[PDB]
Amino acid sequence: MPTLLLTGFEPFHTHPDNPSAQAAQELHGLELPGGWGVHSALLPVEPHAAGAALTRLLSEQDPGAVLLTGLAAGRPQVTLERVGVGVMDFQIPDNAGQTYRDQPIEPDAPAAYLATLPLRAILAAWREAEIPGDISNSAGLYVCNFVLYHALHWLREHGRGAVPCGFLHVPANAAVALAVPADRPPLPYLPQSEITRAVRVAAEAITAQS
Amino acid sequence: MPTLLLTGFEPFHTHPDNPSAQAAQELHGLELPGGWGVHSALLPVEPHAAGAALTRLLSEQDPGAVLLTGLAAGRPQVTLERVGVGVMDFQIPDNAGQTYRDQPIEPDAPAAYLATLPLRAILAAWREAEIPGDISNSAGLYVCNFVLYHALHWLREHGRGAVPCGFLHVPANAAVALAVPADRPPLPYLPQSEITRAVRVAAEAITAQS
Amino acid sequence: MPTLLLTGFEPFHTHPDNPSAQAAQELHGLELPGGWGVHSALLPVEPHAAGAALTRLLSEQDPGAVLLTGLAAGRPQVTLERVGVGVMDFQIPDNAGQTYRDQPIEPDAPAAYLATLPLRAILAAWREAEIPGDISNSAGLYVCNFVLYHALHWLREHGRGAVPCGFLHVPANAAVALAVPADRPPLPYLPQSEITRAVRVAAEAITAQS
Amino acid sequence: MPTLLLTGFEPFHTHPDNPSAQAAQELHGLELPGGWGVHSALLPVEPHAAGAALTRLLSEQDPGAVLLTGLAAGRPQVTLERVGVGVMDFQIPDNAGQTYRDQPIEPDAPAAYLATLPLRAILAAWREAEIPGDISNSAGLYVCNFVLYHALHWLREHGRGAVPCGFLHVPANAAVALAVPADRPPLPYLPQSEITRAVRVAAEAITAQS
Q1: How many domains does chain A contain in total?
Q2: Range of the domain at D96
Q3: Which positions are catalytic residues (chains A, B, C, D)?
Q4: Residue of C47, C48, C54 lying closest to C24 (CA atoms)
Q5: How many other C-beta atoms are found inside a 10 Å radius of the C-beta of residue B187?
Q6: CA–CA–CA angle A33, A125, A118 (5° rounding)
Q7: Do D87 and C114 touch (CB under 8 A)?
Q8: Is A169 a residue of the active site?
Q9: Which CATH number fits the domain that encloses residue B176?
Q10: For residue C191, which residues of chain B lie inside 8 Å, CB to CB?
Q11: Mutate to test the interface with B, among C15, C22, C77, C128 (most CBs of B within 10 A)
C-alpha cells in the first residue's frame, strides 16, 4: 500500500518534449522494496490547473512520499530543490499564455517551505549509481517551483508534514537539445535513459529511507 | 536623521579584494535627497561575528532602510536577492575556516524571509542610469545569504518589519578578475566605479521610495 | 607619419550599439608616443563591402600597424585573436541578410593567418593597467574573422607581412547588455569607458613595440 | 581492407578517465559497411610521443580515413574540429609536466590545416541518430589540436591529402564529471554509451562517404 507519487510536466515553451513526463510515464507502477509502488501523473504547465490536479492526487493517492519532477533546460546534471518559494514570477508565459510578476502564491502563508526529501541520501545513491548531481537552492519561480511550494503547503496544512516531498529538476534530453535554434547556445543534455534512471534511483532512495 | 545602513564584506577565499567593501567605504556619509544619510560598515566573512556585528548596527543605528551588499564572483550584472533562506550550507570555508552542512540558522523561525526593498523601483532606477541588473532568487547559502536572513529576522522580531531591507550582490571588480588563476575560466567583471555607482543608484531609489 | 589603423564595426543583429565603433570613434587622431597617430574607420558588418573598404584603408593609409576591433557579445573580457581562418560560416545573417556556409574566403590561399600583433606585450600592458584579458584562438567565422583574414592576407600579398596586424574583440557595453530580451541569459558587459581604455592601452603597446 | 584509424587519448590532468579512450577501445575492430574496419589506438597526452605514435600508425596502417578523438571537458555535445592550428600553447601541463607558450609546431609549414572529414555528412548522421552536435572552430592549442595538425600535415606531405582526417571532441563522461571537486562548477556530461555511439555514427558516416 505505500505509494510514492511521481509527477512530471507536459512540454512547454519551444520544447517539443519533456523528459520529466517521459520519466514519470516509464516508471509508473514500478514496485520498490518494502511494498512501495510508484504512482505517476502528468501535470500541465499552468499553475492553477497544476495545483488543482496535484491537490486531487495528494488527497486521492494519499502518498507516503512525493517526488515532483520537471525540466530545467540548461542544467547539466539532475538536481534536488532545497526550497520552494511562495512567489510566482514568470520569465516566459505558461501554457495558457499567462505571466505573473512578484505574485504571492498564498496570502498569509509561509514565504517558503524547505523540501522534506532525504536530500543527502539521494545524492549518495546517485553517486553510487555513477550519476552526477547536486542540490539546487532555487527552483525558479515558474510552475515547477509553484507545485513544490503547493505540495509542501498542502501536506503541512493536512497534518502530513512528515511525508517526504521535494522536487527533482532534470536536464534536457536529446529531443529538447536537438530542437534548440542554431543561433542559440547548445544545451547540456542527457539521454532519456539516463534521466529516467536518475529519477528511479532517487525514488528508490526515498522509499528506502522512509 | 533617517539612516540607510549600507554594509559590505571583507575579502574572502582567494579574492584579494571585495568590491562590496570598496563600495560601502566610498559611499559612507553620502547625503541622499530626503534628509537621508548613508552609514557604512564592513562585516567579516564569518556568520557568527557577522551576525553579532549586524545586530549591533541594526540596534545602534536604527536605520530607516538596510542595504546589505556582497560579492558574487561569476555573476555578470548587479542583482537584488529576493529571498534569504534560513540555512547555512558552505561550498567553501568561511574566513575562520569553518563549513556548515544543511544547518538551520534559527530553530523555530521561518524557513525564509522575502527581501522588503522596493525591488522593481531599484531595477527601474538602474535601467534609467544605463545599468544592467536583475532580481536573483537565490543568494546562495554562504555568509551573504546568512546576513540577509539575519537582518530580516531581527527586524521582524523587533517590530521593524516595515524597514525595507535586502541584499545587493555585485560582480567581481578588476582586482578580483585579475587574481583568477590562468587555468580557470575568466570572470565577468565591472570596474569598481561601475559597481559603486550601482550601489549608489540603489540606495537613492530605496530612500526615494522611503 | 607612422599611422596605426584602428577599425570598428557598425551595429548588427539585435544590437542597438557597437562598442567597437564607439571606441574607434573616440580614439581617432590620438597621438601616441614615437610620432604615431591613430586613424580610425568604421566597417560595415558585411564581408564584401568590409573587405573593399579595408583594402582601400590599407592601401591609402599605409599603416605601420593595424588594430581591427569588434564586438563579441557574451565574452567577459577583451581578447586578442590569435588566428584568422580562411572560411566564412555565418550563424546569423550579416547586415545584408546574407549567410555563408563553409565558404572559402579565397581559392588557393592559406587556410589561416596567425595575427602578427605583439600578443604578450598587449596582455602585459593590459594587466599593468588593471584590465583583465586573454588571447582567443577562434574569432568565429563571421565578419570579424573575415576582416582579420582579409587584412593579414592583403598585407602578406603586398610584401607588408611585417606590419603588425590583429583583432581585438570587446565585450558588450551597457547599451548592448540592456537590449537583451528578458527571457535570455544576461550578458557580461563593460562600461564603454573601460572598453575604449582597453583598446587605447592595446594601441599604445602595439606602437611602443613597433 | 580499407581501414579507418580511430584514436583516443589516455587520462590526463585531474581526470580519472578519458571517454575518448573508452570509445576507441570499444570500437576497435568494428566492421563497417563498405568493407571498412576500424583500427583503434590510444595516444599519450604528450605531443612528442603522441606525434611519434601517430606517424607510425599513419605509416603502418595506411588508413582510408582518420578519426582522432579526445576529451573536451566542459563541452555539452560532441563536436567536430574544423581546423588544426600549428601552435602549441598549453594552459595546463601535459602528462610529462611540460608546457609550451606560443610554440610553432613546424617551421616553414602552414599556419593551419582544415579538417578533411565530411563535416556536414557527420552532423546530419548524428542528427538522424538523435545526437546533438556541432562543428567547433577551435580545438584548443593543447595535445588534441597538436595531433590534428600533425596528422593533416603528415598526410599532405606524403601525398595523402585526399584521406579524410579530422578531430572529434567528446564531452566528459560520468566518471569525469563525478571527479570534479565540490567547489568547482558542475560539468556537462554524457553516459559513455552515448559518447561511444556518437563516435560510431561518425565513423560510419565517414566511410559511407568514403
Answers
A1: 1
A2: 1-210
A3: 81, 144, 169
A4: C54
A5: 21
A6: 80
A7: yes
A8: yes
A9: 3.40.630.20
A10: 190-191, 193-194
A11: C77
